[PDB]
């Protein structure tokens, strides 16, 4: 009896100086079949924090529910909402609590920090985490990471002036890298959900992808 199931799905996260984009595909699968074509992996935690998970859907559904409850309990005793950094630090301890029967989930929290600048936290299945600028996790994480490194991090480029990451240029980048991941990865496809975390709230955009 296997308690885990690979359901696929990729989640992206890019942090700006005033925003934070968290995108993911909406295809749930198993083996070679497609469960549903409409299953986004992005969840709105607070008003400035969005979590994205991929992997075993059973654990994603449970982890997300636990995080929702932990946020409510924290607001009851501390009388204030939990910050992005506090939600990342708390997730680490929750993932490591099941260290000998871990959640098969790849989480990528994206929001805004105290200052007001975009924040992105990448997590590992057992709980390890760190804050970065951009991050890709899922079944196409290895296909997208290198592109973001080159395009956003300006790695391996000798003659570039390194222009600031604007919200309009990052919106195209997320759409572009996911259109390339749907051409190679068989777990990525059908629809792309994009959540933009700004100071005026969380916006949501949906773009179609390949269905084959």
């Amino acid at each position: 009896f296997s308690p885990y199931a690979f359901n696929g799905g990729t989640v992206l996260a890019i942090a700006g100086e005033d925003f934070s984009i968290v995108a993911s595909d909406t295809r749930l699968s198993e083996g070679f079949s497609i469960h549903t074509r409409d299953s986004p992996k992005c969840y709105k935690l607070t008003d400035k924090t969005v979590i994205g998970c991929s992997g075993f859907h059973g654990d994603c559904l449970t982890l997300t529910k636990i995080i929702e409850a932990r946020l409510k309990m924290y607001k009851h005793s501390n009388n204030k909402a939990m910050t992005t950094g506090a939600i990342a630090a708390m997730l680490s301890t929750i993932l490591y609590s099941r260290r000998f029967f871990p959640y098969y989930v790849y989480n990528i929290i994206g929001g805004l920090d105290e200052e007001g600048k975009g924040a992105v936290y990448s997590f590992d299945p057992v709980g390890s985490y760190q804050r970065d600028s951009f991050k890709a996790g899922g079944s196409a994480s290895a296909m997208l990471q290198p592109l973001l490194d080159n395009q956003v991090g300006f790695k391996n480029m000798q003659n570039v002036e390194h222009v600031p990451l604007t919200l309009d240029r990052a919106m195209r980048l997320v759409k572009d890298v996911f259109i390339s991941a749907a051409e190679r990865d068989v777990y990525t496809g059908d629809a792309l959900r994009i959540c933009i975390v700004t100071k005026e709230g969380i916006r949501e955009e949906t773009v179609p992808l390949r269905k084959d």
Binding site: F1, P3, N7, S33, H35, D38, F56, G58
Partner: protein, 214 residues
């Protein structure tokens, strides 16, 4: 339950304009043997919810009694509040995941069909605790055979009628009887609308064997 005993095959499910229709053959298989050919694999939770489970039949009977008590318990209070199709689906997802986390799951794959507050709900819960919603569902071998047919009708006609969805369910049941080696030609058809949950059958399909002569 590490190893299932008497199991059931695929359960179909498709949402239509004003309700949800669910089909399931009435057969309890013991390996490759058709042991029980008259068992109902569809249960009516309450007035707006119905359930169709595939897999271990003993687990389905345990869930049938654990759900029946819940509905009865809630009706005793009579405060107006009642479990919706979405609330039952949620409860089942937590029950399936909890069992799976304790290394002792209920070998089943359910299809929850309901109709409350003007919305048709079609849920799906497996033994690992994996759950989602969709316009049309199919478990067991129906995901490889019936799912493709249901999805090919909902792509050009997203909204279906009661008669259209029912005619599509019969076509899928007939295709499952030709290719699934663990299915029977005797099935039940449950429908949940504004009037409630109604079960019909046993029904049969119109199988043709012209290809046997060629």
């Amino acid at each position: 339950t590490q190893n299932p005993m008497v199991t059931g095959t695929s359960v179909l499910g498709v949402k239509f304009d004003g309700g949800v229709v669910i089909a399931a053959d009435m057969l309890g298989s013991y390996g490759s043997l058709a042991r029980f050919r008259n068992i109902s694999r569809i249960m009516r939770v309450n007035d707006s919810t119905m359930l169709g489970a595939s897999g271990d039949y003993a687990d389905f009977q345990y869930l049938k009694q654990v759900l029946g008590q819940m509905v009865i318990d809630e009706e005793l209070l009579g405060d107006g509040h009642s479990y919706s199709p979405r609330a039952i689906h949620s409860w089942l997802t937590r029950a399936m995941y909890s069992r799976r986390s304790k290394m002792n799951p209920l070998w089943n794959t359910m299809v929850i069909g309901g109709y409350a507050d003007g919305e048709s709900f079609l849920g799906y819960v497996d033994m690992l605790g994996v759950a989602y919603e969709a316009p049309s569902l199919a478990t067991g071998y129906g995901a490889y055979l019936a799912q493709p047919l249901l999805r090919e009708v909902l792509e050009k006609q997203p909204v279906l009628s009661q008669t259209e969805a029912r005619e599509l369910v019969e076509r899928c049941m007939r295709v499952l009887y030709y290719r699934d080696a663990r299915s029977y030609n005797r099935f039940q058809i449950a429908t949940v609308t504004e009037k409630g949950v109604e079960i019909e059958g046993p029904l049969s399909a119109q199988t043709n064997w012209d290809i046997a002569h060629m």
